[PDB]
Amino acid sequence: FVKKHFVLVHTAFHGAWCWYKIVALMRSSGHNVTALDLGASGINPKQALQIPNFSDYLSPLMEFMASLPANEKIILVGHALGGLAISKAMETFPEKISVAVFLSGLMPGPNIDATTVCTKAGSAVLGQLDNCVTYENGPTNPPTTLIAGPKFLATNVYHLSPIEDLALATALVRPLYLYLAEDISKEVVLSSKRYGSVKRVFIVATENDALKKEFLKLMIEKNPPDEVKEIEGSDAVTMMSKPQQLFTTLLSIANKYK
Amino acid sequence: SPFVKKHFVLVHTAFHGAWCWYKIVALMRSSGHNVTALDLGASGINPKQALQIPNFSDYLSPLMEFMASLPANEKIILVGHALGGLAISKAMETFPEKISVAVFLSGLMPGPNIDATTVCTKAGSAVLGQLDNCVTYENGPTNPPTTLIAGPKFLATNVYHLSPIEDLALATALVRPLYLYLAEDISKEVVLSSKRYGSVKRVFIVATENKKEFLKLMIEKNPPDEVKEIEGSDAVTMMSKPQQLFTTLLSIANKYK
Ligand SMILES: CCCCC(=O)CC(=O)O
Ligand SMILES: CCCCC(=O)CC(=O)O
């Protein structure tokens, strides 16, 4: 047995809260675990309109990374959009991350940039069902914020999770600022000396979506990680739908990658 | 007793937010009822930060607004948890016609007679200075402490002690500070009378293992139309005894149709 430090980064609309099942599992197993709210997510005091810059969004993670004690390594886990966050963290603090885990996460690299993975990720999300956008940047300008609808969540995201967790999400999802492609590319810059030097595992966790799986496959091909693992039966929120499996997978990764 | 579709309105306590009711919400939406769970000021995903709302009417406003916008002839079952007892009390005075039955789940239940002054001072003593709860002095040492912050140990020992462990984790990630409202503010915001507040039906739900003597005391000074019990509940009944709460709420809905 070795005590580990897991660090959990959520996706669009979400927060630290979505990890509650895993947090509990990690804690009562005697491991250390931090689950962070990004900008204007969960109980982060910023509203979405106050963080138009991607660095503002990534800020809770960056400052936490900068705050980590000397001889300490972590297991950095990023879910879906959470992948961009943990990528930037790897480039900036490679000497603090024992291994980075991309749970069906956006995983850009030199051969497939952040601009690419984001336009594609946002295609499945924008316009789907009862989702909606705001126009505080002007009614003739590109949409400002994106808001997850209850029906979108139920049918596209939590479609394989318990009904209480849908309810939980419904009372907690917060709007996401629609960061400009240019801003995201300027922000998430990756080298092979740094980001490339961090051990990296991808977790394919999707079901009943061939197009999404292809996107995850394409990302693994253009930016090959050290390992690829898999969790079957998962909807778009694995920490809700397949939590025991995910915790096992995360403990397994942690122990062998020391 | 035939099933009639009803609308439940759920109101949380200090540090919490609509999220705490997640299990109740799912169970009602499954049964064919309407349910709305609300964030009060600077609770859950409400935009206001606690320091931005030193007046009680601002803590209460999301409920008061919801109540006002309710269509003409619709009545509701209104559930106040603990601190949420004051909010539903205020709502009972302003909009008595709109509430078929008010339900006080271990709630602060002052009457026209026992002032909201006394009730808060008692509620404060068991929270303030308890274990790892800490206060903050944003307006300096000259003035009263500004916010109250619930500590993870206080949560583990006095609030969540009988709840599944994952619910404790959920809470550590979501609890928010609460502005320490002055009892002079609450006194003047919560003005209760026997004509209005008194006209609304009231049920109190005791949580056995929640103070067992203070909750007992409020019933003497302000008698509800009934008392009910849920055994083995901690301070968050909706977390520890959700099904018992859910069925009790159904049962309650019916007797006071
Ligand atoms: C930019 C839109 C976010 C893309 C996603 O990855 C959707 C999700 O995680 O729910
Ligand atoms: C002064 C606020 C105390 C009210 C409470 O009793 C809050 C709780 O449920 O722990």
Q: Taking CB atoms and an 8 Å cutoff, what residues of chain A touch B173?
A: 15-17, 19-20, 23, 35, 37, 42-43
* Closest C-alpha among A157, A100, A99 to residue A124: A157
The boundaries of the domain holding residue A198 are: 1-258
Instruction: Answer for the pair B94, B104: CB distance below 8 angstroms, yes or no.
Output: no
CA dihedral A191, A195, A198, A200 (to 10 degrees): -110
Q: Which residues between 137 and 166 in chain B have a beta carbon less than 8 angstroms from any beta carbon of chain A?
A: 164-166
CA distances to A32, A245, A251, B139, B168 from A3, rounded to whole Å, are: 7, 20, 10, 42, 21
The C-alpha torsion from B172 through B173 and B175 to B177, rounded to 10°, is: 100
- Asked whether A148 and A118 are in contact (CB, 8 A), the reply is no
What are the structure tokens assigned to A28, written together?
């009562």
Query: Is the CB of residue A81 less than 8 Å from the CB of residue A12?
Result: yes
Angle between helices B22-31 and B242-255 (to 10 degrees): 50
Whether A20 has its CB under 8 Å from any CB of chain B: the answer is yes
Ligand nearest to the CA of B235: 2
List the resolution, Å: 2.3
**Residue with token string 């601190």:** B83
Chain B residues with CB inside 8 Å of A167's CB? 22-23, 25-26, 29
CB contact under 8 A, B173 and A15: yes
**Which of A218, A227, A39 is closest to A121 using CA atoms?**
A218
* Residue nearest atom 2 of ligand 2, based on CA coordinates: B124
- Residue appearing with tokens 């009639």: B4
Calculate how far, in angstroms, residue A194's C-alpha sits from the geometric centre of ligand 1. Answer: 26
Task: Give helix B84-94 / helix B116-125 axis angle, nearest 10°.
Answer: 170
Ligand nearest to the CA of B16: 2
Size of interface A-B (CB pairs under 8 A): 73
Sign of CA dihedral A91, A97, A102, A103: negative
Which of B228, B13, B239 has the alpha carbon at shortest distance from B123?
A: B13
In Å, the largest CA–CA distance within chain A is: 58
Q: Is any Cβ of chain B less than 8 angstroms from the Cβ of A47?
A: yes
Cα torsion angle, B154, B160, B161, B164, sign? negative
Cβ-nearest to A167 among B26, B168, B176 = B26
B64 C-beta neighbours (distance < 10 Å), count: 16
| Any A CB within 8 A of B178 CB | no
Round to whole Å and give the CA distance between B113 and A9.
51
- Give the dihedral sign, CA A82/A37/A257/B169: negative
Most A-contacting residue of B15, B35, B172, B238 (CB-CB within 10 A), to test interface: B172
Going B3 to B4 to B5 to B8, the CA torsion angle's sign is: negative
Sheet holding A5-9, edge to edge: A32-36, A5-9, A74-79, A97-103, A200-204, A227-230
**Which residues, 6+ apart, have CB-to-CB distance to A83 below 8 Å?**
A102, A105, A106, A107, A108, A117
B124 lines ligand 2 (CB under 6 A): yes
CATH of the domain at A36: 3.40.50.1820
Taking alpha carbons only, the member of B254, B217, B236 closest to residue B245 is B236
Phi, psi torsion values for B212, nearest 5 degrees = -70, -15
Please check whether residue A216 touches B, CB under 8 A.
no
User: Which residue minimizes the CA distance to atom 8 of ligand 1?
Assistant: A12
Answer for the pair B99, B93: CB distance below 8 angstroms, yes or no: no
CA atoms in the 13 A half-sphere facing the CB of B185: 12
- Determine contact: B19 vs chain A, CB below 8 A: yes
Structural domains of chain A, count: 1
For residue A152, the Cα-to-chain-centroid distance in whole angstroms is 18
Q: Which among A24, A37, A166 is the nearest to B166, CB-wise?
A: A24
Cα(A2) to centroid of ligand 2, in Å? 39
Which amino acid belongs to residue A94? Answer: P
| Contact (CB<8Å) A171/B26 | no
> Which residue has tokens 């709460």?
B245
CB atoms < 10 A from the CB of A135, how many? Answer: 12
Q: Tell me how far the alpha carbon of residue A11 lies from the centroid of ligand 1, in angstroms.
A: 7
What span, in angstroms and rounded, lies between the C-alpha atoms of A223 and B36? 45
The CA distance from B39 to B47, in Å, is 10
Rounded Cα distance between B147 and B42, Å, is 12
CB environment B95-122: b (16+ within 10 A), e (fewer): bbebbbbbbbbbbbbbbeebbbeebbee
**Distance from the Cα of residue B35 to its chain's centroid:** 16
Is residue A16 less than 8 Å (CB to CB) from chain B? yes
CA–CA–CA angle A9, A10, A12 (5° rounding): 135
